[PDB]
Design a protein around this ligand. Structure first.
Ligand code: ICS
Ligand code: CLF
Ligand code: CLF
Ligand SMILES: [Fe+3]
Ligand SMILES: [Fe+3]
Lengths: 477, 522, 522, 477
């Protein structure tokens, strides 16, 4: 509110930085004007972080192994390198799946080459081949192997592509080498791009000549939904209620056969544009499959997306969509009637990764809650182009915010609720401000769809209005 | 569907009939899943001794490790000093993972910065990154000290930390008098405890190496305490309390308890407590230095004996009755202070608890894992209680530590059926607990999956997990517990005996089937 | 049959096929047991609401009570004084039962004597028993004081304790200067807490009633602390520690903490610690007297206000967050000492843990029972955490206490679905948890059977029990816990949140069925 | 041995008593002489305790309600009076049973009248009738009700016999009034006698005119075994293997129908003579049923008892007895070979209620283990006559020993192990002497028979040789 004070706050916050750091950071903070369609004139993104400023961004390995390849349940993913990277990323992301872990599913397990000094000095391609043999011996029901490279693999002269080719020819198994070394790029976005390229080059085209799959005019594939807390499932039950058939979902609860069957669908429904736009566009160019973005956060966005998707098919699909909307109307109406009075008028600040900082605005507004500030760790300029129209006037936008910047912004704006990751949760809890984890749903959820909206509203109500926030000050002080 | 009065999260919402039908259709239509009978056969095969023989032949594949990399331990060591910023020279994903790991364990803010080295530095080095990062960190977060460790990227490209920091001081990026200790922490060597050791040695060398002329041993009448990689705040608290009861002057080096337990009173404190620079400078003037976890403080021991000329005692970790007694006696001998009556009464109370619980504790079989010092202290205390350790696993252990643990086992008839494994991961331990079933496991949160696997074989084959160690992610506030001293022994005994009693109560809750042994009094 | 390498106790020895066949033959041949279908039908009927309506119409039958008789509390109060022998005038079976009860709960020796009254005393009274018992006890066990309570037999006969003790003193059975306080503790009035109150009032009246001429309020600059019936050692310890942190002179009357936690060092100590006679005599000189558990210390309050002329503050039990704050500020006002920074930091840490666990604690439904003060403090703490008390039961409660608890519940939106029951037993609570199922129960060991019954209806109907209160017989060393102050609140919150997480982990351990929610991080 | 210093120790312990107390207590301590069969001239028992000397004895209510009537699973037992007595005795004794608690079994439940002041002043007969009405309403599957009187019932003049008669006639239900007030007698022994008399008067003769029960020549009834930890089941399996049909079990895991069928058996096998000799003699006099005492503690006693019991029947029974002995020989021989070397030479001091101080001696001697001191809480002189020949020469015997007496005796004798109750366990553990609970088997067992002998030996070994006993002295003390 009152744009000039927001600019004054930005200047006051930037006053502490050195000249180079302040010049760089001035470009990544902006005041929203909804009429602006080109975000390059106000905010800059997808650049390197300033050293020593305590950024929140991850690495390309997190973007590829932790986000894209990890949810694939029937595949075994080898963290090629030292032990740390696979260990810190093991089961940290709630990409839900159905399977028997250790036999035919391996999502929550940590496979690594566990590099030692001799591996660094002399390379680890022979170790990689021996590891692949051991994996084949001890996990016979796996349907594929991916090799996710960590930093030393890129640094030393290792050639994992030739090893993957030789071993895949020898054992007749799909082995996908991913060069997702953490020093590449500036964030997880390059990891997304590298993982998409690997999927395109090694997995997607296996069934190009296969025509044994029976296709229907209602074949769609969910792209960029990773089943956080079951989110994708909560989406799927709606799409099948509309009369459509979901052949595949990428990549939460996903199987390699689903990915290989994806080029046979009629329509691609992309939830996370940021992480899967590469493969969606490639599929459009090569197979002629149209793709479209949708939003299932909140009843309004869900209804709009359902109608837009139904508009792509015949009359029966549209009638079924209307039936689904009518069936689910009373439930979310009751949820709103129960929870909006306790949440109306509250102000929220968000700082999340590439998609959610703009996707969940509608759900908050459905509860009578208003977003004062939003930002991204690693989004590109098109994400901000969408965000500027999705956000309100004179609100704050921040790209790759530092801990000091975010703390100062929160201290001045004083929001009622903050949605961010685990690395700000306790910082802002000690400040006396309710916090919701917007990556893992605070180990709750799902939040997608009509079923997820009730859980979302309940969680926001339970955290915002908890009595604990009234007891931070001692009565004698 | 959702009812507004009773809203269901993912469990048990996805147990609804419509979701079940949807998942069945999905699996039967597009997953191309193996038949369930094949899955059952493969699982049963993985539970067999032949599968264990195949599993233990592994030489190039690691499955579910029980260790981390050095910079995590270096960051934990750096956090223990007053107003000190941990600074990791290398890539930022490492720092993100470190902070997330420690946030999930401690449920507290963790401060740590990186210079965000990228593909450009992969061929030029990270000198400019170090200069700009030091300047930015000092300007922004205002630390009194910056402790620099390294990621594997800078280790492979071979960046020279000393030259980089000296050049940063020379060109005026940060003041020449600003303390910037450094240490190389390669992730492909050792584990996180090695990183802790390297960071502590680097800090001590920075603060004491060049000013040893004026130091006199025993002049300040204090005892230095080096705790090592420690994730229980109660351990620091109990060490301080026991030293204070004895009336012994002490200096705890790398004390992170205050910064890891800040109150929630409306303000955020980035720094709190910690070892001061004056204490580090005055450390060589102490009577002696005591290392709480000697098996990952070898480099620190070498520096302290070689340079400070302190005659470091050969003490085990002060875990359990006998080793707590030995630690107290050695401290008394060094400081000249008698052991007070309160500690004697506390020891007697621990002995009373042992006598009270011996009947339920006797003969129980445990598979345990963790860090070397903690594992051997737990084994010693289990032998003291009359329990039988059967599978002892230490991924980051070495052959000398294994020899020491074997010697400890050979001195007790309860260690007759014990095997010590070094370099093995939790898949090996899963095979071992399937083929040689113990009564309980003791370990970190990663053990829970193993328990699930055992429950999949049958209720009669399930091995319950007891959460002692690091990290613990699925329980709240267990990081406040104590494992050192008599208080830690009391807590461990209570946890073990009550876990046994809950398991017995669960096994005998069946009405008219097993509830004849559902005794009110135990 | 038994295998010498794996010897089976009753469970699971009696699950062998031969024993199963033997038991089946016994039941089919000579037990004349009702058919199993009839048993299942009757059980299902007992789980219904019609059975609950019939159950709550009881007027004469009590089933599974949640209280004891007065002399047990009298003995507990007497044990809190230095070198004091509890002496119960009446029948010896009562003393045997009291000692067994306290031994099982505390796992410690409990000393108490009886004068062994028989039918001869039922005819002519127990004056000779009093004389001989006092002489024998003084000669044998050498106490500094003998505190006399009564059984129901002496109360019904109408023995005059005062005249009996005076006649013992006059005839030379015991010295005239030997302190022998006494109290009438009828078992048909009140409960054990009433006996504690009566015994404390008797001792205080013995030591202070006839020496008020030279007493000036506030002369010794101390505050008297009366804890009441207390079975957690940590509560005494935390009260003393908090008062010592504030630098407030205090005199804790009836302190049994030492004698119930003697060390096992090779000697038996009949007596250990306790409030001295000098402290009891100097009590009227204190600034004020604070009653930790006012709802069963009413007679003590009347005596203290009417004789010592102390303005006893209107304070709740210091449980949870708000009431601990009120106790601290009242003590600060009385003593004039400011609240130190350490206590503020402890409160902030408690608030931090509450913020950390609020997501899992929110909305959970609890059925609790115990003594009035403990029950109301626990209800207050649950309301502070956002939990939902549902069934609040207090067998020894009264109408004024019920009104106070209802007033507490009205002040919180989370107390909307709560009902307070006084005069109801645990069979009523079993009906309540079958008809209106809560998430958890909080209570003593007697609740375990209820859990069994719930599990018999189904795993989805099972209500787990959390053991907080008195007595706890099926777990070890829980009597060392704390429930008062910030430390007690921390322990209670940790227990509750980890019980919730343990239940969640148990329900999600089914592989390929519910393990999709078996998250490593919670 | 060394009788002289034992008498000196007795005098030294006694010198601190007052004159009357010392004179009384001198008669209750003795030095064993195995040639003596008349223990009256050597020891005095079954007398009232000295006031204020901390005796271990219970009351008659404990002897009747807690010991005899309580194990009966299909009956409901009302502790008539104030709340304390049944609450302290609820589930404190491990008399095991099979049933559905609260429906057709009620052992671990506490039923009470909960007397208040108005009940004391104005009586509780009407309250008793209303309680019986409510019991019938709420527990329809109960097969009988017993009313166990507490002290005020006998003191205020309540006529529970008339109420029981009227309500039993009204309901066609067995209601047994037991006047087991705690001030009657001097210990639990009179409780045993009163409970046996109640069984005789109200329960035993109910099927005297009924002849529908098919009888066999091999019908026996176990009397005086209360299934402590499953002891009675382990005895019954041995009896059934030998070829006898066990009709009744008194009273652990017992049913009222079994008690009613008892007068139809051919032999009574009495384990606890002290508590059941009254009913055994009554049955012998009225029905002509012979009874015999047996011991199943340790392999030697078990084999002797099995052979003696088989001697009461035909040759097939003796052959089956030999078969059972031969079958079970290797198991207890292996137990002996495992545990006797660890226990040989150790000296034991016992103090239990009325049967076990002499019954468990054989099992101890089977492990090369010597009993040096024994005593009873409430035994009669016939029990001491039986005990004199089972103890070694110059061993200590104590009746109704005081806490001070037992502490001094243990301090001087210094036994390696003590077997007593819960009220001495912690006292002697704090002195550094291993202790076994010989009432509840330390929540272990069973100890009867061949199966129980292994558990017994394992428990003695685990407590005797525990490392904790070597740590009581601090290294600096
Ligand atoms: S993939 Fe991306 S950071 Fe699109 S790397 Fe990140 S499970 Fe975020 S805003 Mo964690 S681009 Fe998904 C994401 Fe969004 S891990 Fe999840 S929540 S919708
Ligand atoms: S940016 Fe990313 S997470 Fe960092 S290393 Fe690089 S791929 Fe990995 Fe794993 S081992 Fe440890 S944490 Fe690093 S320093 Fe060597
Ligand atoms: S010797 Fe025996 S146990 Fe004693 S009373 Fe008498 S029958 Fe009973 Fe129950 S209520 Fe309490 S404990 Fe007594 S004093 Fe009134
Ligand atoms: Fe915290
Ligand atoms: Fe104890």
């Amino acid at each position: 509110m009152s744009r000039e004070e927001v600019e004054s706050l930005i200047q006051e916050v930037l006053e502490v930085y050195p000249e180079k750091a302040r010049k760089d950071r001035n470009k990544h903070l902006a005041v929203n004007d909804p009429a602006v369609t080109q975000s390059k004139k106000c905010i800059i993104s997808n650049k390197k972080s300033q050293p020593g400023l305590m950024t929140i961004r991850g690495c390309a390995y997190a973007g590829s192994k932790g986000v894209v390849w990890g949810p694939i349940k029937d595949m075994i993913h080898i963290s090629h390198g030292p032990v740390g990277c696979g260990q810190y990323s093991r089961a940290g992301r709630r990409n839900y799946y159905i399977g028997t872990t250790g036999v035919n599913a391996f999502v929550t397990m940590n496979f690594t080459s566990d590099f030692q000094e001799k591996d660094i000095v002399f390379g680890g391609d022979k170790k990689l081949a021996k590891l692949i043999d051991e994996v084949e011996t001890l996990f016979p029901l796996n349907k594929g192997i991916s090799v996710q490279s960590e930093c030393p693999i890129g640094l030393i002269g290792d050639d994992i592509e030739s090893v993957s080719k030789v071993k895949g020819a020898e054992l007749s198994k799909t082995i996908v080498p991913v060069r997702c070394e953490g020093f590449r790029g500036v964030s997880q976005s390059l990891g997304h791009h590298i993982a998409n390229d690997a999927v395109r080059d090694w997995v997607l085209g296996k069934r190009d000549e296969d025509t044994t799959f029976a296709s229907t005019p209602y074949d769609v594939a969910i792209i960029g939904d990773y089943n956080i807390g079951g989110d994708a499932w909560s989406s799927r039950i709606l799409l099948e209620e509309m009369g459509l058939r979901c052949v595949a979902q990428w990549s939460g609860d996903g199987s390699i056969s689903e990915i290989e069957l994806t080029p046979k669908v009629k329509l691609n429904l992309v939830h996370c544009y940021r992480s899967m736009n590469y493969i969606s566009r490639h599929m459009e160019e090569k197979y002629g499959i149209p793709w479209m973005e949708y939003n299932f956060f909140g009843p309004t966005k869900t209804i709009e997306s359902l109608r837009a998707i139904a508009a792509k098919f015949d009359e029966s699909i549209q009638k079924k969509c209307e039936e689904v909307i009518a069936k689910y109307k009373p439930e979310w109406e009751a949820v709103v009637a129960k929870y909006r009075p306790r949440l109306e008028g509250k102000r929220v600040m968000l700082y999340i990764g590439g998609l959610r900082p703009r996707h969940v605005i509608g759900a908050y507004e459905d509860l009578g809650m208003e977003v004062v500030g939003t930002g991204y760790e690693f989004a590109h300029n098109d994400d901000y182009d969408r965000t500027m129209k999705e956000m309100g006037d004179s609100t704050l936008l921040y790209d790759d915010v530092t801990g000091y910047e975010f703390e100062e912004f929160v201290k001045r704006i004083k929001p009622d609720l903050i949605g961010s990751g685990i690395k700000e949760k306790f910082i802002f809890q000690k400040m006396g401000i309710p916090f919701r984890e917007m990556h893992s749903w605070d180990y709750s959820g799902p939040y997608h769809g009509f079923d997820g909206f009730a859980i979302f509203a309940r969680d926001m109500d339970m955290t915002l209005n908890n009595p604990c926030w009234k007891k931070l000050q001692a009565p004698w002080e | 569907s959702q009812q507004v009065d009773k809203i269901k999260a993912s469990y048990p919402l996805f147990l609804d009939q419509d979701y079940k039908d949807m998942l069945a259709k999905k699996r039967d239509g597009f997953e191309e899943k193996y038949p369930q009978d094949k899955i059952d056969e493969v699982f049963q095969w993985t539970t067999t001794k032949e599968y264990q023989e195949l599993n233990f032949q592994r030489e190039a594949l690691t499955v579910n490790p029980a260790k981390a990399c050095q910079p995590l331990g270096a960051v934990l060591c750096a956090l223990g000093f007053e107003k000190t910023m941990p600074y990791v020279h290398g890539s930022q994903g490492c720092v993100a993972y470190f902070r997330s790991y420690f946030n999930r364990h401690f449920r507290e803010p963790v401060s740590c910065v990186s210079d965000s080295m990228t593909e450009d530095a992969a061929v030029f080095g990270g000198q400019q990154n170090m200069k700009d990062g030091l300047q930015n960190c000092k300007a922004t977060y205002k630390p009194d000290m910056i402790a620099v460790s390294t990621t594997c990227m800078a280790e492979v490209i071979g960046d020279d930390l000393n030259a980089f920091i000296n050049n940063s001081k020379k060109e005026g990026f940060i003041p020449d008098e600003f303390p910037v200790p450094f240490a190389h922490t390669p992730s492909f060597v050792g584990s996180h405890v090695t990183g802790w050791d390297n960071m502590f040695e680097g800090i001590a060398r920075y603060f004491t190496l060049k000013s040893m002329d004026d130091k006199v041993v025993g002049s300040n009448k204090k005892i230095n305490i080096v705790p090592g990689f420690e994730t229980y705040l109660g351990n620091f608290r109990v060490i301080k309390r026991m030293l204070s009861e004895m009336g012994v002057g002490y200096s705890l080096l790398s004390d992170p308890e205050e910064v890891l337990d800040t109150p929630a009173d409306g303000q955020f404190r980035m720094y709190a407590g910690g070892t001061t620079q004056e204490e580090m400078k005055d450390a060589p003037n102490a009577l002696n230095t005591v290392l709480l976890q000697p098996w990952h403080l070898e480099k620190t021991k070498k520096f302290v004996e070689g340079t400070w000329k302190h005659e470091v005692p050969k003490l085990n970790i002060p875990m359990g009755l006998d080793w707590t007694d030995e630690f107290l006696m050695k401290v008394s001998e060094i400081s000249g202070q008698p052991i007070p009556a309160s500690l004697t009464k506390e020891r007697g109370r621990l002995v009373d608890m042992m006598t009270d619980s011996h009947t339920w504790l006797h003969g129980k079989r445990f598979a345990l894992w963790g860090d070397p010092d903690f594992v051997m202290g737990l084994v010693k205390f289990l032998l003291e209680l009359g329990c039988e350790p059967v599978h002892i696993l230490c991924h980051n252990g070495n052959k000398r530590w294994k020899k020491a643990v074997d010697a400890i086992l050979a001195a007790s008839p309860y260690g007759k059926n014990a095997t010590v494994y070094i370099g093995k991961d939790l898949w090996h331990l899963r095979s071992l607990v399937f083929t040689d079933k113990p009564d309980f496991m003791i370990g970190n949160s990663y053990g829970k999956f193993i328990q699930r696997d055992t429950l999949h074989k049958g209720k009669e084959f399930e091995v319950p997990l007891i959460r002692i160690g690091f990290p613990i992610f699925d329980r709240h506030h267990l990081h406040r517990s104590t494992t050192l001293g008599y208080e830690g022994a009391m807590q461990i005994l209570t946890t073990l005996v009550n876990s046994i009693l809950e398991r017995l109560d669960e096994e005998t809750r069946g009405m008219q089937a097993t509830d004849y042994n559902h005794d009110l009094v135990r």
